[model samples]
Target: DLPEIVASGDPVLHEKAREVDPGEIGSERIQKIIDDMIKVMRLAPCVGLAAPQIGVPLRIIVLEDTKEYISYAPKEEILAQERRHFDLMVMVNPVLKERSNKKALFFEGCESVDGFRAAVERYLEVVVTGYDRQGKRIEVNASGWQARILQHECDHLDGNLYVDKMVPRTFRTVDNLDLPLAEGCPKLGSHHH
Candidate 1:
C-alpha cells in the first residue's frame, strides 16, 4: 500500500516529473502511487486523474472511459458504440502528434482545479504516443471527449492551466452557469473556412 496521499496545490504538483526508469515500474512505490490514484479518482467520481493532482508530480495518469451507452435489444440495430472501462495509464512524456482540423468546445474540469467547469476548445480527435506502465511504447488515437481530456492533462504537464487555453470572452470562474460558447469548427476532414 502507498503512504498517505498528498493533496493538490503542493509544490510537487507544479513541478514536472522526471523520466521514469523502466526498472522502477511495478515496484512497490509505483504500484502504491497507482493504487492511490485509483482510490482518489473513484472517490471523486472523475473520469481521469493525473499524478500531480493528488500531490505527486509524476508523468502518470489513470483514466476511466465513462462513455454513455444505449443498450439495444436483439432485434434492434444500432451503430453508435460506447467504451466503458477503467484504465490505469502511466504515460511518461506524452505528446499529441496530430489532430483533425475540426474543433469542439466542451465543459472540462481538472482534478487540480476543483469546482470549476470551463468551456475549452480542443481537437475533436487526436493521435497520442507515450510510454506505458512497463515502460513499453504505446500509441492511441482518441476522439470526442477523450481527446479533450488528453489535451487538458498534457497542458498541465507543461505548466499550463485550462484557463490559459480558454477563449477571452468565454472565461468563467464562478458559479455562473450562463456563458456564451463558440459554435466550434466543422467535423473532421471538413474544409476550414
Candidate 2:
C-alpha cells in the first residue's frame, strides 16, 4: 500500500530533508520506503516523488517516465519539452551538477501542492549523482523533460517548491490555466486544437 502524501500545509514540506547514512542505503526500512514512494508516485500520476513529499525527512526520491506516462502531456507539448521515457529509478542523497545555462519553460505541478500549475524555468541539462536502492553509486545525465524532473525532485530535498520560482502571473488552477505556450514550442498557429 502507498503511504499518505504530505500536503503543502505540512511543515515537513518546508524543511530540508536529512541525508541517509551510506550504510542505511540497503536497510529494510529504506527499501520499504522506496517501494511505497514508487507506488504513491505512480498512483498520483506524477513522474517523481521526493521523501519530503511523503512526510519523510530523508533525502530520497523515486521517478519514472514511461511511454504511457509521457502520454499525460499533449502531443505538441511533448515535442516542445523533448520528453523522453525513463524506467523507474530511486535516488538517495542525490546531488545535482553540470547544469547548463540554457533553460526551458514549462508548466509544472506538485503532489504536495496539488490543484494548481505554474510556468517555471528549469535548466536544460544536468548531471545527478546519488546512490541507488542497493547503495551503488550512480550518475544520470538528464536533459529536456527528464532534467526538469530531476531538478524538481531535488528541490524538494532543499525545501524549495516550484512556486518559489514560478511566474506569478502564470499560476492558475489546473482547470483554468491561461498561459501561452512557450515560444518555439509547438503550436497550431492558424489551426485550432
Candidate 3:
C-alpha cells in the first residue's frame, strides 16, 4: 500500500522531480517504490503512472496497457486511436531520445487531474532511453497508445501535465466527452484538423 495519489495542485506534481541515482535503484527503498508504483498504477487501473503523482518526486514511472484496460473502448474508437496493449514496464531517470514527427489528436485523462478529459496532440511514435528498476540501461520504442502513455508519464518528470498541452477548447468533464467539439477544433482521433 502507498500514500494516496496527489492531485494537480500538489507541490510534488508541479515540481521537476529528482532523478533516482543508478546506484540507488537496487536498494530496498527505491525497489519498494518501483514495486509500489506498479501496485498503485494497476490498482488505480490506469495505464501509466509516475513517481511524482504518488508524491515521491523521483524520476520513476510504471506503465502497462492490458487487454482488460483496452477493452474499455469501442472497437471503432480503438482502431481510430490506434490502441493496443503493452506489458508492464518500469523506467527510472528516463529520457526522450527520439520521437516521430507524425502526430495525432485524441482524448486523454490524468489520474492526477480528476473529473476531466481533454484532446491532446502527441507524437505517433517515440524512443526513450532510461534505466530500469534494476538500474540497467534500457530503451523503449512505443507507438500508438503506448507512445502516448510514455509521453504522459515522462512529462510528469519534467513538471508537465497534459492539461498544459491539451487543446483548451476540448477540455471537458468525463461525462461530457461525447459532446461536440468547438467550431475550429480538430476532431478527436484526427491526425490533423
Candidate 4:
C-alpha cells in the first residue's frame, strides 16, 4: 500500500533526504512513491512536484507535461516557436554542481508550505547530476525557468525553502494567490488526456 501523504512542516520536510542507494532505487516502494506523486500532482494541478513536498524526504522529483495555468498553451511547437520549453524529467538524488553567477528573481512557492510567495534569486543556468528512473546516472544542463525549478527542488533535498533564498523586501505573504505557470514551461500535451 502507498504511504499516507504527510503534511507540510512535518519535520520530515525539514530533514535532508539521504542519498538514494542503488538498492532503494529499484525497490517497488520508490516506484509506488513516484506513482503517488503523479496522482498528487494531478490532484493538486501542479506542473512538477518533489518527493519532499509530499513528505517522502527523498531526493526524487517528477515533472509532468501538464500546464498549471488556465491561459497557458499546450503545444511544443508553439513553445518552441516562442522560444519557451519544458522537460518532464524525473531526477533522483540530484546534485547541482555548476551554476552561472547571473541571478534572476522569481516568485516561488511550495506545496509543503501552504501560504505565501517569495521572490527568490536563482542562477539562470545549472548543471545537475542524478540517476534516472532506470537507475542510470545522468547529468543535465538546464537553464531558464526549468533550471530555476531544479535548483529550488535541489534545495528542498537539503532542507531549504525559497524563503531562505529571498532577498530583502522580496518576500510577500498573501492569501488565495494562485501559482503562476512555471515560466518557460511548454504547454500541456494534447495526448495527455
User: Which pairs in model 2 have colliding backbones?
Assistant: none
**Residue by residue across 1-193, what tens digits does model 2's lDDT show?**
5679988878888889999998998999999989889989888878999999878999998999999877776898788788899899899999997465777777789998879998888888899999999999999899888888999999999999898888556778888876665555443221111
Error of 3 at 62 (Å): 0.5
Model 2 earns a TM-score of 0.90
Candidate 4 backbone overlaps, count: 0
lDDT of 2 at 9: 76
1-193: candidate 4 lDDT, tens digit per residue: 5444555667777778877786688789887887888788767766677787777867897765434342464465334222234656788888886465665555667776666776666676689988987778999987666776777778878877776666555445556333453456333212111
Model 4: runs farther than 4 Å from truth? 1-7, 65-83, 174-193
Give the winner by lDDT.
Answer: 3
| Candidate 3 residue-wise lDDT at 70 | 79
For model 3, the run of ten residues with the poorest summed lDDT: 184-193
Candidate number with the higher TM-score (1 or 4): 4
lDDT score of residue 132 within candidate 1: 71
Q: Pick the candidate with the highest TM-score.
A: 3
Q: How far out, in Å, is residue 146 in model 3?
A: 0.3
Where does model 2 exceed 4 Å of error?
178-193
Q: Which of the predicted structures, 1 or 3, would earn the higher lDDT when compared with the native? A: 3
User: Which one wins by lDDT: 2 or 3?
Assistant: 3
**Candidate 3, residues 1-193: lDDT per residue as tens digits?**
5768889898888889998989999999999988888888878889999999888989999999899987878999999888998778999998974465788899999999989999999988889999988899999998888888899999999899999999878999999989999899987664542
Candidate 3: the clashing residue pairs are: none
